[PDB]
């Protein structure tokens, strides 16, 4: 099982999220209290990389999903057969991969040879000039309620900062729910606090 231990590392690596709120029109919204992202299928999911100092050239940013619950954690998170077989290809992403990056022609996808786990990696870019963070647009290509894969089992996304040689520079994570009404579902999951 890949580590999910938070690790700010040498560069002070942390995640940020847009403050999108829970209006019914929201397609992507993050709950600080639950550290949980609520997303519509295949919609832009902005994840902000915040660093205290700029990591070197060739730094890369990896995303990987694992099941949150210990009893499922060894199971590879992958798209259900239906979504696997859907005609929603962007021509870069493997059809089985739950997490894609959109709007980045330098995206790289990995099926780990030994663990079989899926990940998607992009070059780290410094914040645009005048910005304080780097935003990656992720897409989640299968629903939490999909019976053929996650089937209501919660998943985590682990975001890793690695150098060009693959050494770990930093790590963070957040829970993800892929659903029809993220605004409503966030608001609802938060009313039980
Ligand atoms: As999202
Ligand atoms: Zn699915």
CSV table of C-alpha atoms and ligand atoms in Angstrom, one decimal:
chain,number,residue,atom,x,y,z
A,1,UNK,CA,0.0,0.0,0.0
A,2,UNK,CA,1.4,3.4,-1.0
A,3,UNK,CA,2.0,5.8,1.9
A,4,UNK,CA,-0.5,8.5,2.6
A,5,UNK,CA,1.6,10.2,5.3
A,6,UNK,CA,1.5,14.0,5.0
A,7,UNK,CA,5.0,15.3,4.3
A,8,UNK,CA,5.6,19.0,3.7
A,9,UNK,CA,9.3,18.3,3.1
A,10,UNK,CA,12.1,20.7,2.3
A,11,UNK,CA,10.0,23.0,0.1
A,12,UNK,CA,7.0,23.4,2.4
A,13,UNK,CA,4.7,21.5,0.1
A,14,UNK,CA,1.0,21.8,0.9
A,15,UNK,CA,-2.3,21.6,-1.0
A,16,UNK,CA,-4.8,24.3,-1.5
A,17,UNK,CA,-8.3,24.3,-2.9
A,18,UNK,CA,-10.7,26.8,-4.3
A,19,UNK,CA,-13.3,28.2,-1.9
A,20,UNK,CA,-16.2,27.2,-4.2
A,21,UNK,CA,-19.1,26.9,-1.8
A,22,UNK,CA,-22.0,24.5,-2.0
A,23,UNK,CA,-24.4,26.1,-4.5
A,24,UNK,CA,-26.3,23.5,-6.5
A,25,UNK,CA,-24.5,24.7,-9.7
A,26,UNK,CA,-21.1,23.9,-8.3
A,27,UNK,CA,-19.3,21.2,-10.2
A,28,UNK,CA,-16.3,20.8,-7.8
A,29,UNK,CA,-16.1,21.8,-4.2
A,30,UNK,CA,-13.8,21.1,-1.3
A,31,UNK,CA,-14.7,20.6,2.4
A,32,UNK,CA,-11.9,21.8,4.7
A,33,UNK,CA,-13.6,20.2,7.7
A,34,UNK,CA,-13.8,16.8,6.1
A,35,UNK,CA,-10.7,17.3,3.9
A,36,UNK,CA,-12.9,16.0,1.2
A,37,UNK,CA,-13.3,16.9,-2.4
A,38,UNK,CA,-16.8,16.6,-4.0
A,39,UNK,CA,-16.6,16.4,-7.8
A,40,UNK,CA,-18.9,15.8,-10.8
A,41,UNK,CA,-17.8,13.0,-13.2
A,42,UNK,CA,-15.1,14.2,-15.6
A,43,UNK,CA,-15.4,17.8,-14.5
A,44,UNK,CA,-12.4,20.1,-13.9
A,45,UNK,CA,-11.1,19.5,-10.4
A,46,UNK,CA,-8.6,22.2,-9.5
A,47,UNK,CA,-5.9,21.3,-7.0
A,48,UNK,CA,-3.5,23.9,-5.9
A,49,UNK,CA,0.1,23.2,-5.1
A,50,UNK,CA,1.5,25.6,-2.5
A,51,UNK,CA,5.2,25.7,-1.7
A,52,UNK,CA,7.3,27.9,0.7
A,53,UNK,CA,10.3,27.7,-1.7
A,54,UNK,CA,10.6,26.7,-5.4
A,55,UNK,CA,11.6,23.1,-6.0
A,56,UNK,CA,14.3,22.5,-8.7
A,57,UNK,CA,13.7,22.1,-12.4
A,58,UNK,CA,12.5,18.7,-13.4
A,59,UNK,CA,10.4,18.4,-10.3
A,60,UNK,CA,7.2,16.4,-11.0
A,61,UNK,CA,3.8,16.1,-9.5
A,62,UNK,CA,2.1,12.7,-9.1
A,63,UNK,CA,-1.5,11.9,-8.3
A,64,UNK,CA,-2.8,8.5,-7.2
A,65,UNK,CA,-6.0,7.1,-5.8
A,66,UNK,CA,-6.3,4.5,-3.0
A,67,UNK,CA,-9.3,3.2,-1.1
A,68,UNK,CA,-9.7,5.0,2.2
A,69,UNK,CA,-10.8,2.0,4.3
A,70,UNK,CA,-8.1,-0.4,5.5
A,71,UNK,CA,-10.1,-3.5,4.4
A,72,UNK,CA,-10.0,-2.2,0.8
A,73,UNK,CA,-6.7,-0.5,0.7
A,74,UNK,CA,-4.8,-3.2,-1.1
A,75,UNK,CA,-7.3,-3.1,-4.0
A,76,UNK,CA,-6.1,-1.1,-7.0
A,77,UNK,CA,-8.4,1.8,-7.6
A,78,UNK,CA,-9.5,1.7,-11.2
A,79,UNK,CA,-12.5,2.7,-13.5
A,80,UNK,CA,-15.5,0.3,-13.6
A,81,UNK,CA,-15.9,-1.8,-16.8
A,82,UNK,CA,-18.6,0.6,-18.0
A,83,UNK,CA,-16.5,3.7,-17.7
A,84,UNK,CA,-13.4,1.8,-18.9
A,85,UNK,CA,-15.3,1.0,-22.1
A,86,UNK,CA,-16.9,4.5,-22.5
A,87,UNK,CA,-16.0,6.6,-25.6
A,88,UNK,CA,-14.6,9.4,-23.4
A,89,UNK,CA,-10.9,9.1,-24.4
A,90,UNK,CA,-8.7,12.1,-24.5
A,91,UNK,CA,-6.1,10.1,-26.4
A,92,UNK,CA,-3.5,10.3,-23.6
A,93,UNK,CA,-5.1,8.8,-20.6
A,94,UNK,CA,-5.3,5.0,-20.3
A,95,UNK,CA,-9.0,3.9,-20.3
A,96,UNK,CA,-8.7,2.2,-16.9
A,97,UNK,CA,-7.3,5.2,-15.0
A,98,UNK,CA,-9.6,7.0,-12.7
A,99,UNK,CA,-7.6,10.2,-12.4
A,100,UNK,CA,-6.7,12.2,-15.4
A,101,UNK,CA,-5.0,15.6,-15.9
A,102,UNK,CA,-6.7,17.9,-18.4
A,103,UNK,CA,-5.1,20.8,-20.2
A,104,UNK,CA,-1.5,19.5,-20.0
A,105,UNK,CA,0.1,17.9,-23.1
A,106,UNK,CA,3.1,16.9,-20.9
A,107,UNK,CA,1.0,14.5,-18.8
A,108,UNK,CA,2.4,11.1,-18.2
A,109,UNK,CA,0.5,8.1,-17.0
A,110,UNK,CA,1.9,5.1,-15.1
A,111,UNK,CA,0.7,1.6,-14.6
A,112,UNK,CA,3.2,0.5,-11.9
A,113,UNK,CA,4.9,-2.6,-13.0
A,114,UNK,CA,5.1,-4.1,-9.5
A,115,UNK,CA,2.0,-2.8,-7.7
A,116,UNK,CA,-0.3,-2.3,-10.7
A,117,UNK,CA,-1.4,1.0,-9.3
A,118,UNK,CA,-2.3,3.8,-11.6
A,119,UNK,CA,-0.9,7.3,-11.4
A,120,UNK,CA,-0.7,10.5,-13.4
A,121,UNK,CA,2.3,12.8,-13.3
A,122,UNK,CA,2.9,16.3,-14.7
A,123,UNK,CA,6.0,18.5,-14.5
A,124,UNK,CA,5.9,20.9,-11.6
A,125,UNK,CA,5.5,24.4,-13.0
A,126,UNK,CA,6.1,27.4,-10.6
A,127,UNK,CA,3.1,29.6,-10.0
A,128,UNK,CA,2.2,31.8,-13.0
A,129,UNK,CA,3.8,35.2,-12.6
A,130,UNK,CA,1.6,37.1,-10.1
A,131,UNK,CA,0.1,33.9,-8.6
A,132,UNK,CA,0.9,32.3,-5.3
A,133,UNK,CA,0.3,28.6,-6.2
A,134,UNK,CA,0.3,26.1,-9.1
A,135,UNK,CA,-3.0,24.7,-10.2
A,136,UNK,CA,-3.5,21.3,-11.7
A,137,UNK,CA,-6.8,20.4,-13.2
A,138,UNK,CA,-7.6,16.8,-12.4
A,139,UNK,CA,-10.6,14.8,-13.8
A,140,UNK,CA,-12.2,11.9,-12.0
A,141,UNK,CA,-13.5,9.5,-14.7
A,142,UNK,CA,-15.7,7.1,-12.7
A,143,UNK,CA,-18.3,7.7,-10.0
A,144,UNK,CA,-18.1,6.8,-6.3
A,145,UNK,CA,-21.5,5.0,-6.7
A,146,UNK,CA,-20.2,2.9,-9.6
A,147,UNK,CA,-20.9,-0.7,-8.8
A,148,UNK,CA,-18.1,-2.1,-11.0
A,149,UNK,CA,-15.3,-0.2,-9.2
A,150,UNK,CA,-15.5,2.0,-6.1
A,151,UNK,CA,-19.2,1.1,-5.4
A,152,UNK,CA,-19.7,3.7,-2.6
A,153,UNK,CA,-16.3,2.9,-1.0
A,154,UNK,CA,-14.5,6.2,-0.2
A,155,UNK,CA,-11.2,6.9,-1.9
A,156,UNK,CA,-8.2,9.1,-1.3
A,157,UNK,CA,-6.1,11.0,-3.7
A,158,UNK,CA,-2.5,11.1,-2.8
A,159,UNK,CA,-0.5,14.0,-4.3
A,160,UNK,CA,3.2,13.6,-4.3
A,161,UNK,CA,6.0,16.0,-5.1
A,162,UNK,CA,8.9,14.2,-6.5
A,163,UNK,CA,12.2,15.2,-8.0
A,164,UNK,CA,13.3,14.3,-11.6
A,165,UNK,CA,14.8,11.0,-10.2
A,166,UNK,CA,11.6,10.0,-8.4
A,167,UNK,CA,12.8,10.9,-4.9
A,168,UNK,CA,10.0,12.0,-2.6
A,169,UNK,CA,9.9,15.7,-1.9
A,170,UNK,CA,6.5,16.0,-0.4
A,171,UNK,CA,3.1,14.5,0.0
A,172,UNK,CA,-0.4,15.4,0.8
A,173,UNK,CA,-3.8,13.8,0.4
A,174,UNK,CA,-7.6,14.4,0.4
A,175,UNK,CA,-10.7,12.3,0.3
A,176,UNK,CA,-12.7,12.3,-3.0
A,177,UNK,CA,-16.3,11.7,-3.7
A,178,UNK,CA,-17.3,11.7,-7.4
A,179,UNK,CA,-21.0,12.5,-7.5
A,180,UNK,CA,-23.9,14.1,-9.3
A,181,UNK,CA,-24.5,17.0,-6.8
A,182,UNK,CA,-21.3,17.8,-5.0
A,183,UNK,CA,-22.7,21.1,-3.5
A,184,UNK,CA,-25.6,19.2,-1.9
A,185,UNK,CA,-23.6,16.2,-0.9
A,186,UNK,CA,-20.9,18.4,0.8
A,187,UNK,CA,-23.5,20.5,2.5
A,188,UNK,CA,-25.2,17.3,3.7
A,189,UNK,CA,-22.1,15.5,4.9
A,190,UNK,CA,-21.2,18.6,6.8
A,191,UNK,CA,-24.6,19.0,8.6
A,192,UNK,CA,-23.7,15.9,10.6
A,193,UNK,CA,-21.1,17.8,12.5
B,1,LIG,AS1,-13.5,18.3,-7.8
B,2,LIG,ZN1,-17.7,4.0,-13.3
